[model samples]
Target: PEWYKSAVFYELSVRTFQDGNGDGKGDFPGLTSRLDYLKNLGVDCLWLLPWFPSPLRDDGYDVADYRGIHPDLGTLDDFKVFLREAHARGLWVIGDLVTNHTSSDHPWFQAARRGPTLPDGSPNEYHDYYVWSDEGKEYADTRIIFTDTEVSNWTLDEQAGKYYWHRFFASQPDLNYDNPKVVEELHGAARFWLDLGLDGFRVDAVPYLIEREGTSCENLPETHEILKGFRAMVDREYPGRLLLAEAEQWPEEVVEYFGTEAEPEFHMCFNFPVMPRLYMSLKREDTSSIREIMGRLPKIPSFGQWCIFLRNHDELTLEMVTDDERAFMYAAYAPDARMKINVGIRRRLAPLLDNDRRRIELLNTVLLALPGSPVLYYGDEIGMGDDLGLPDRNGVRTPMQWNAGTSGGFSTAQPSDCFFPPIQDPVYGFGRVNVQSQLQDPSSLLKWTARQLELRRAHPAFAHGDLTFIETGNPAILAFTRQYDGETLLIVSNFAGNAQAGLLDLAPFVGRAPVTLSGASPLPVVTGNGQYPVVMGKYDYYWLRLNS
Candidate 1:
């Protein structure tokens, strides 16, 4: 929990980050070689997308083996070496754990299909590792998560002569947690990775762990119990190891994953509603939506933290928004049909914001200054663009641009053999936008982002501090303060493209002088008069320290 509270998380996909051995696909060896780059970027932790053996049906979300790393990514030894190298540089690493479901091709599922039946006429041993119903009508109340691809939560298993329950793609069948053996197997996998030195896990699809009749079956009571069991084991053996929940429900519902201090569960949970509202506030040039969302969030236990990010491995989900808001977002951000996927937009941060550097910096400032630990998507630092022509969510999963060279310095493999084509658009293409190119330029987004993170790291208050919104009369101006242990930071942002001015109440910090952290200039004293004049340029943001 201490490591996470003030940490900056960098999320990356092993298959697309960097390729080693000229194999076209990114691997642990390649990632290991880039450890210096991450350390220099001011990242405190690395949150990797699933690198487990999988069919790649859902982009490795449909895991085929829980115990082994995907051959395409690397072997177990390679991962261990990577982990060791990462820790040597003071960089913590957490991985994606798809515990809710596994690929249909998993050995357990294969055996379950062929294993003999018991005397009671039920599937035996490994055969009962998955959820199967004689009829497909059970738990019909649950809504379809992958609405674009999955017609129903139940998939017919002709060979097994039963309907299997799956909350996601049909290729990923949900595990039968009711079976003690399944629980044992999952716990064993958790222990194996923890013992091998994994810092923690981003438990994927946590809400749909269990289902109940006459209920929507999203966040059931049993799901918390299952999580508590895992937490208990982790606490007993690996005290500092964290379990971050990937439940994409609203904050009120998502807070349940972070159980009370007496019975703790997930160490962190993603705040889903806040992400969409951030985008909406920028789109509408109003802070009301963001304020409302933040206000609705319930308090969590002292050990609990919230993982916040502007973009992640999945599509920019609008499921947390209302129907009208979703439609508005689609029209505002995804005018192209290809950009719209399922109930969300599938574009990257650069393209989504139209490569506006000022707006990008403003958003990054807000993300780093927010209450939760900020997570940065792989290519977002250098403003990498997405290729929407690619199918599914692969567009945003494109190779990271490291230089202005062939394959963007991501791989030495031939163009034909490349895992995915690098961005070719002249403006935001790898040739024009990359780490090598940005490193040489003093005024680059990559450098600016590093500076932002460094400033955030200097103040522990930004991560675990208490947040208080400053009602700046102007709707376009978003203002808040983070305070902890006598240190206070006042952050103000102009979301609109036009300059804005407003009055803010800094009465809480009465006689303190405001010193601009970024500019290194001193502002007028608070005077304890309740209100202070605030001014900001187009898409500008500031981190002002209230000095005593």
Candidate 2:
């Protein structure tokens, strides 16, 4: 519990993180090289994207085999080495499990599609392994994740002469957890990975594991039951093992995955609303967007937590927002229909904020102070920018900029042949904003992130403390206080580029000596009025602690 509550997670993509073998792609050995960087930054857990053998249809999310490592990422032994070394450093490792779906290339699917019946005529044990129906029109209400490419939820399998249900892309077939054998098989696979010494799993697309004909087939009661059953299995057999549900739905809907009452089956669920609100705050330069959604984040069982992030490997996800909010996002960032996706606002943090270092820092400040544990995407600390001009996810996923040298010092591979091209824009180009240069500058964004994490570690209240919203009249200022017993921390930030002044009533925090962090910026002591105005520089944020 201490490990999770105090964790600062670093989300790593094995294929793009680092390439130690110089194979033009990042592999397990490449990831091994960066463990020191993560460990040095006091990263408690490393959440790796799926590394299992995949057909690469959905960037490894459509896994073909669960137990084996993708050959491109090296062998199973490499992952074992990664797990061992990560644990030895007292760092926990959590991996993404594609539980809801498997690549269409999976053997079970192949067997099921080979003919109408199972080999033994026992209803094709693997027949119910995946959700299947006679017609594609039956599950219209269930919804399709890849509506752009998939015309129906059920795709006709030419080989099997039947249709299979898929919530995501057509190539990824949804697993049917309604079958007891399917559930047992999934549990067995989870145990198989755990036996390899992996710590936890980020259950992918958990809400859609089971489907019903009439309903939307998401966040259904049966889904929670399945999750609860999975949670119970973890508790009974794999004590201390963690399960993070990937409920990429509305905030209120996402919270339901935590299960009712204390100690929900899973330990944590991703807070899907935070990403959009972060962008919304930057676009509107108002705290209301952030506060509004946060208000909707329902309380969960004490044992369960919420995973939060700035950018994931996927496209800019702005789909979770409402129509008005979506309109705002489109106007502010997209302005064109091509730029928008379902609910996510597509773009990396730096580019999303127009490469404003101060705004990026301010958001990071908020991310660290927010109630849930903060998950940092790779290269975000270095203030990496996305090139909307780049293709697909290529823009945001450009190689990690390390220096001005070859391949932006990201890898020794050739430029065009690299996993993803380096950001070459003049302002925040690869030559300008790599790690080598930033490492020397004390004021680098990297240093700021490190210092903030360091400060976070010193404050236990940050991990377990209660969040109290500060009453400030300035719409641009987002302020909050985290309190635990004798400790009180006041966090104030300006979301806009222009200077702003916010008045806060601190009389309630009487005996506290507010010391400003981030720099030598001194905060005046307030002893009267319970209310005092605080002035802030453009895109500035302050961490004021009560030094009693």
Candidate 3:
């Protein structure tokens, strides 16, 4: 069975989740201890941020060593223990694989930058590990991803007496997949983890893996070929492991990563376009944006599923939108404009919505009801706030606040000296929004989210079903039905902040029974006319089961 299609994933960072050793950083032991907590929340998979050894300049995306864990986080033995413990709870752990590039400090790059010959001027294999050029002006069609910080994709390497190509930061050089050994290297690196019982990988920056001279160097046929090779490996050796693509592109182009139903590439890919548009629908208090985007999305291959999320390690990227919508999103979400960076906003979910509990719940409700496996960010359960006082996007990626005690019980000492400060806003402070207090309260957002997850787990229709948007005649009232096998679930939501009513068209289920999932109460049965009447309160939603 393809377990990933119906699974709910939790995105967490080890260095920011919990500190078991009390060294002001989160480690595998702490994450292992919290496995039960995650199990209780009903998550089926764990999407961990990169824990590979790195220079810490790109938040672990720049990989200095692919086969080793960070010393500060834990050792290989500790990671094995954590993997075993998570498997005991029936949780699948997938790590981030930055195969597109590696840190300049990596041994391959270190040797490559010294030129492609030995003292006797013979050929060296390591020199071809990275893309190198003498003129530094190739691939002019490829756009610079980091428009905010980087100006060119080619950078001079004086030691190598040549220029290296990098789609991202200058310090992270792109690997040369044209060299067969480079491809072989990535395959061996992936095998190292799979052999250690690691579940899968979320391949990063996949579109830029293999670049061509005449094209835009995105979604190329060659890129798909490399992904297919990995697919074959996983299918042969490890049958149940998943390959999730981190490709951020339009849905039509992104679906190319999912080769076909019979011969697939990736089991899952992040629904990046839907995320920014979902926020747009929220701010505009209308569902047109979401409906339009979903309407345009070409159907993915039967075996291909999407990972839907509200927030993740990368807060909210705006490149999915046009220039007009991007401007609209920046103005609406952040008035200061300083909050925007790298074509995205560097703020958390709570502060972006101004810490409104109603809207936060509403957004989560929409996220859960969407047509993909929902991925919950670490602290968004309690609606954690952000801090612009810190540098870059560290404000939104603060450590998890477990309690209101010293350092919010994150560590024995404060992390500001080492990593980042605790989130202590007057409204969203640890004292008020910590998990310790939420666990004791019946009506906390955390409690509400747990119930939603539990119910979603029980109802498989939301995960594996086909979606059909209902005609409500009112833009604020977005209604959809998810039917898998014989199970049918009707999810309706009100995007407005005030009361609204609509006559939903349910012609096929004229004589079905309606039961609300949250309270387990009965509602009026469908009539022969198929015009069902519903009135929703402010920011209200219903997950109703339709039974014949």
Candidate 4:
């Protein structure tokens, strides 16, 4: 829990991060070799995407087996070696665990389709592993998440002669938490990874775990009960293990997953709404929306934390925004139909910001300076662009650009053998934007991001402090303070692309000097002043430490 509160998370996919085996696929050995890169980048934890055996449906979210690694990635022993190396470097690792649903090819589903009894007449426990109905009339009111693809929550299974409930794709059927045995089976799956030294899980689709009739079947009370069981088991069996919920509900409803301080559920939950609002605020060049949205978030239990990110493996969701706001975001960020996916945008941070260095730095500053733990998506540090031509969410998930070498140093295999082609556009291609290129340049965005993260890691206030928005009359500037223990930090950023000036009240800390985080440049002390003059260049940001 302590590790999570102050951790800087790096979310990456094994299939695209690095390729070590010359097999054109990213494997454990490749990732292990690059641990130093992440360590040097100031990443405190690694949040890997689902690496379990699957048919590649839903990009590994449809886990076929929870206990084993995908052969394409590596063997269990390879993962153990990688984990050991990561731990040695003081880097924590949390794997993505999908308990909400399983691939139709999973053994449980295969066995369930064979009726309640096995060929030998013994009890077939697998039959009750997933939710099944005689017809497709159950939970019909539940909203379909993958609206572009899925027509309904229930899909008729010809093999089982019944309709199986699935929250996302029909190929992935939801597991039945109503059956107590299903709960134990999931617990066992969790323990399998924890036993192998995994720090915790980014628990997938947490809200849709348990569905009941007469309701929308999202974020049910029974789901929380099951989550509590998970928390209790982890606490009892493996102390200090974390469970971060991937609940895409609004911030108001998402806090419920944290439960009470005495009996908690997840150690963290992704702050979904704030992400889209962040993009909207930047596009509108107004801080009102982000300030209001952030201010409205309910305080969670001390044990619970919020996971924040600019981009990730999934689409940049806009489901939490109003219809008009959604339209504004679509028009501004995703004018192209392919850029819009379901209820969100699919472009990466760099392309979304039009490769504007200053804007990108400003947003990254906001993410790290916020109260929640910052999760950086792979290639974002290097300002990698997305290939919009790729289908689905794969555009933002292309291979990591390491250098100008063949396959961008991600793989030694042929381009045809690579999981996905590297970004080939002239501007963001491997020859232009990559780790090797950025590492050599002192003014590169990657270096700037690494330095910002370094500053954040050194200051406990940035990660474990209370956030209070600073009142500034200028709408173009977003200002806030982070206070923890006796230390206080002030962060101000200009949302607009023009120079701006504002007056900020520093009455609370009249005697403190403002020192820049990166360069430690000292500004005038408050001196009980009525208002301090604040001037910022276009898209500039300031992280000032209030020295006592």
**lDDT by residue for model 1 over 1-548, one digit each (tens)?**
47888788999999998899888999999999999999999998999999888889988999998899999998999999999999999999998888989999898888776545855677568877888888887887888988888898888887878888899999998998888788889899898899999999999988888888999888899988999999998999898887898888887888999999999999888878789988889999998998998998999999888888999878999988899999889989988887878799998998889889988898898888888988899989999888877888898988999997778988988656778888878887888999998999998998998888888888888887899999888999999988888788889899998889999987777788889886779998887576999888899897888896
Residue by residue across 481-517, what tens digits does model 3's lDDT show?
9998778999998888899999999899987888988
By summed lDDT, which 10 consecutive residues of candidate 2 come out lowest? 336-345
- TM-scores, in order shown? 0.97, 0.94, 0.97, 0.97
All candidates' lDDT scores? 0.88, 0.79, 0.87, 0.89
Number of clashing residue pairs in every model? 0, 11, 0, 0
Q: Which candidate leads the pack in lDDT?
A: 4
Provide the lDDT at 164 for model 4: 85
Candidate 2 residue runs with Cα over 4 Å from true position: 118-123, 261-263, 335-337, 387-391, 518-522
lDDT per residue, candidate 4, 1-548, as tens digits? 38899899999999999998888889998999999999999998999999999998888899888899999899999999999999999999999888889999899899898877778999788888888889687777778888899888888888778888888899998899889988888899899999999999989888888888898888899999999999999999999888998888877889999999878899899988688888888878888888898878899998878898889988899887899999899999987888888899898898899899889999999999888899999999999988887788899998999999989999898777788888877999898999999899988888898878888888888889999988777878898899998889999989988888899877787878899877789998887664889888989898898987
Q: lDDT value for candidate 1?
A: 0.88
To one decimal, what is the Cα RMSD in angstroms of model 3 from the true structure? Answer: 1.4
Error of 2 at 214 (Å): 2.4
Q: Which stretches of candidate 4 lie over 4 Å from their true place?
A: 116-124, 527-529
